[PDB]
């Protein structure tokens, strides 16, 4: 629920990823017969449907600012993960509370007989 900064958003998203599900041949599983080190990349295009790309840039800037402090607080050198921790708190925010129906949690389905 955020809006763009004075900067100018380019609505296009042209991106690359390392994901590649499966393998073309069984030997491609093997690094010895694997693609050149740059061959892992794949690419695609997205458009600013519903303002999503531009929204993403603003969100990213805010996240970057928040992240900068967190990184200052880290003691580990290369911070390989964070999302895993976030997944843990996703669960913790939903669990360990009392929860039959009365509490505002656990998405309990309506009760049948």
């Amino acid at each position, epitope marked *: 629920a*955020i*809006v*763009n*900064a*004075q900067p*100018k*958003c*380019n*609505p*296009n998203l042209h991106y690359w990823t390392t994901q590649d599900e499966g393998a073309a041949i069984g030997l491609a599983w093997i690094p010895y017969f694997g693609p050149a080190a740059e061959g892992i990349y794949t690419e695609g295009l997205m*458009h*600013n*449907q*519903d*303002g*999503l*790309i*531009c*929204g993403l840039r*603003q969100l990213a800037n805010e996240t970057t600012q928040a992240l900068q402090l967190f990184l200052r607080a880290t003691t580990e050198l290369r911070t390989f993960s964070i999302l895993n921790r976030k997944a843990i708190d996703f669960l913790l925010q939903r669990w360990g509370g009392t929860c039959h129906i009365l509490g505002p949690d656990c998405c309990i389905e309506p009760h049948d007989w």
Partner: antibody, heavy 120, light 107 residues
Framework: EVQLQESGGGLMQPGGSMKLSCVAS????????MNWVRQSPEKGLEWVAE??????????HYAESVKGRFTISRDDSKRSVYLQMNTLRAEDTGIYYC????????????WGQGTSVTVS | DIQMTQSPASLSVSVGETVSITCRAS??????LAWYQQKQGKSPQLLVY???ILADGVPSRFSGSGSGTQYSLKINSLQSEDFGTYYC?????????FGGGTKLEIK
């Protein structure tokens, strides 16, 4: 739905000054910046000015052909906007509009009914 | 500042006709470009969000294309409700620029 309305229009003598204005509701001002545009049968639509959100410290811009002939203002508690014309010189007879929109689109997605402002 | 033009300055049309509009400009790396239309006695209304994403409540008939100096508007078929004039604009950042527009003439 933006509830926008416009005020302060109509004929005025040349060499004057006026604060053209707008008011709106149902779209909080905290999430946007606004533009003034103008149109004439002789010109088509043209941009007039930009009013930034306070996060940009209310920075503003004006078309260079009108810059310094107008200033802008806004009030985010009143949800109101002012064109604050510095002058009422000539050729200002085009229809005026004030616009706003989603920052992840552009301000074109909301507009007024427009108003007529003219010069003698 | 980026300059822009449109053509044909008007197009004569018939109902259900497929149409398109050319809009050209000083180069724009941004796909920020967008289109809108107005009717006499009516405030302009957006037709498409920047690049090709359609404005909400716009009919599926609407389409468009391109980037940089060349881009276009397309409509698969026409309804009498679409009479008006049409425009395009540079929203790449500031100052905003607008096309002279076109007129949807009827046959």
């Amino acid at each position: 739905e933006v509830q926008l309305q416009e005020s302060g229009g109509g004929l005025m003598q040349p060499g004057g000054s006026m604060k053209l204005s707008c008011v709106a509701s149902g779209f909080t001002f905290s999430n946007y910046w606004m533009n003034w545009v103008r149109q004439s049968p002789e010109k088509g639509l043209e941009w007039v000015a930009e009013i930034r959100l306070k996060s940009n410290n209310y920075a503003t811009h004006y078309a260079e052909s009108v810059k310094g002939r107008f200033t802008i203002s806004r009030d985010d508690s009143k949800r109101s906007v002012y064109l604050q014309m510095n002058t009422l010189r000539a050729e200002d007879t085009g229809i005026y509009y004030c616009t706003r929109g989603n920052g992840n689109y552009r301000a074109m997605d909301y507009w007024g009914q427009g108003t007529s402002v003219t010069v003698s | 500042d980026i300059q822009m033009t449109q053509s044909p300055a008007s197009l004569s049309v018939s109902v259900g006709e497929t149409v398109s509009i050319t809009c050209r400009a000083s180069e724009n790396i941004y796909s920020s470009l967008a289109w809108y239309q107005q009717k006499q006695g009516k405030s302009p209304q957006l037709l498409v969000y920047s690049a090709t994403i359609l404005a909400d409540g716009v009919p599926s008939r609407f389409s468009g294309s391109g980037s940089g100096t060349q881009y276009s508007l397309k409509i698969n078929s026409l309804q009498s409700e679409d009479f008006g004039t049409y425009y395009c604009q540079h929203f790449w950042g500031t100052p905003y620029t607008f096309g002279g527009g076109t007129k949807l003439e009827i046959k």
